[PDB]
Design an enzyme around this catalytic site. Structure first.
Site, mmCIF file in Angstrom:
data_model
loop_
_atom_site.group_PDB
_atom_site.id
_atom_site.type_symbol
_atom_site.label_atom_id
_atom_site.label_comp_id
_atom_site.label_asym_id
_atom_site.label_seq_id
_atom_site.Cartn_x
_atom_site.Cartn_y
_atom_site.Cartn_z
ATOM 1 N N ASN A 142 -1.151 -4.267 6.416
ATOM 2 C CA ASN A 142 -1.692 -2.640 5.626
ATOM 3 C C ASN A 142 -2.262 -1.598 6.750
ATOM 4 O O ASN A 142 -3.383 -1.691 5.683
ATOM 5 C CB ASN A 142 -1.844 -2.460 3.895
ATOM 6 C CG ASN A 142 -1.715 -0.992 3.233
ATOM 7 O OD1 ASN A 142 -1.516 -0.816 4.301
ATOM 8 N ND2 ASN A 142 -2.548 -1.042 2.055
ATOM 9 N N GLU A 150 -5.328 -7.530 -5.397
ATOM 10 C CA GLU A 150 -5.996 -7.128 -5.554
ATOM 11 C C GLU A 150 -7.503 -7.492 -5.875
ATOM 12 O O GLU A 150 -7.482 -6.956 -7.329
ATOM 13 C CB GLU A 150 -5.751 -5.783 -4.834
ATOM 14 C CG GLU A 150 -4.613 -5.395 -3.995
ATOM 15 C CD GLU A 150 -4.236 -3.900 -4.150
ATOM 16 O OE1 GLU A 150 -3.327 -3.517 -5.084
ATOM 17 O OE2 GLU A 150 -4.950 -2.522 -3.323
ATOM 18 N N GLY A 198 -16.647 -1.569 -2.950
ATOM 19 C CA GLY A 198 -17.144 -0.596 -3.362
ATOM 20 C C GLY A 198 -18.163 -1.022 -4.640
ATOM 21 O O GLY A 198 -19.264 -0.205 -4.598
#
Lengths: 247, 247
Positions: free
Chosen positions: A9, A164, A170
């Protein structure tokens, strides 16, 4: 057995020159014969990418498409146009679209049924956020996401599921190969209860967390990890290392 | 005076074959020397379209782009990709994206500032719905939409504004050249108070309602209508007639 599947991706990155380099490298790279590689460049570069690929194991996919083939939907991509230029897949339900672009569970389900119906493979993305993870809702979330698709799609033959771990983006947290194996196993078990053991055993479930040349090998012995949906590493030379990570 | 501008929004339509026909027709067609034609095909065909164009008056534009040049925004188009393949414009704020894809006023404003900052021309779309029209909020709406952009954009030199009478789409109502002239004049006067008379006098304001080969000529004497943002007709031979509607 389930064929190793490596999706790349590119996200919102790349130019004609950089993608030419990515493809030519794949053209000369020494990779297994029994591997499925799908590079997913921005729509603007789909046609060009297909024209450059000279590797049987490599096909091209889009990063998103609409739920109709044509019409008054300014700004969208169409699975028919993706097919027209020689591409073979489309990523649907990526976390960046479910979050930033508010694509809900049914929107993804509707897009998946349509793509498959037009003869385009689907890299279906699912995954829970840190908040959902801490609330112990990991399974509830992936099951809800998959259930929505199951309402519209009964055949997953031309589908690959990418997990995912949004909770690891983060947040200062890191998912491990063991984390991946556990959730992939739960996902396969869940889908088996909805589609039967056979279909579930043929479904490729890809690890969509941070995957790169350095850590791909750490997933080689995870039985329910059938490949990856690679992020930024897919734009680099190390993408080839990921493809060869199970040699 | 203001150069006549004809944009062709293909929307979600086209194939390599059909677009080749559209471009080859424009290449051999007899069009005015002082006209700017911008065809806007799906992102998947941007590069190919640019490669086919051989007419100086014809350039290419994208139907939408994100507010950043690159990054983790799976499925988006980037203004840098537009430039990379030779395209020159991007349509922003089209009613179909404001409605179906919930793109709000500030999102369009941010996208416009970013696109312009990258040297990409912007076809800025605005317009009110049937309900807003009925409530007599036409001016309140276009002004609100424009004000949001004005917060981020102080120079409209590389901008062309397209007024979309959304209230006339599938409602049984029809806008007239007189309707167009009236709202265009109001839009120009409003922008004059914000950008100054000079900038407003140079700004092209395109009629974005139903515009085709049959009715294009009925707008020829409307002083404040500087062109069109054509829809379905841009996929047909009559697109040429629209371009020549002011000979």
């Amino acid at each position: 057995a389930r064929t190793f599947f490596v999706g790349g991706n590119f996200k919102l990155n790349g130019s004609k020159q950089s993608i030419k380099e990515i493809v030519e490298r794949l053209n000369t790279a020494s990779i297994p014969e029994n591997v499925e590689v799908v590079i997913c460049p921005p729509a603007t570069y789909l046609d060009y990418s297909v024209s450059l690929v000279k590797k049987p194991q490599v096909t091209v996919g889009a990063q998103n498409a609409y739920l109709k083939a044509s019409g008054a939907f300014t700004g969208e991509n169409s699975v028919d146009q993706i097919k027209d230029v020689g591409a073979k897949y489309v990523i649907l339900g990526h976390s960046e679209r479910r979050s930033y672009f508010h694509e809900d569970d049914k929107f993804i389900a509707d897009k998946t049924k349509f793509a498959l119906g037009q003869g385009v493979g689907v890299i279906l993305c699912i995954g829970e956020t840190l908040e959902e993870k801490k609330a112990g809702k990991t399974l509830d979330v992936v099951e809800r996401q998959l259930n929505a698709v199951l309402e519209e799609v009964k055949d997953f033959t031309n589908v690959v599921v990418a997990y995912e771990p949004v909770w690891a983006i983060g947040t200062g947290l890191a998912a491990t190969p063991e984390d991946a194996q556990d959730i992939h196993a739960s996902i396969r078990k869940f889908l088996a209860s909805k589609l039967g053991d056979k279909a579930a055993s043929e479904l490729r479930i890809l690890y969509g967390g941070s995957a790169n040349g350095s850590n791909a090998v750490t997933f080689k012995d995870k039985a329910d990890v059938d490949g990856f949906l690679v992020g930024g590493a897919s734009l680099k030379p190390e993408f080839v290392d990921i493809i060869n990570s199970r040699n």
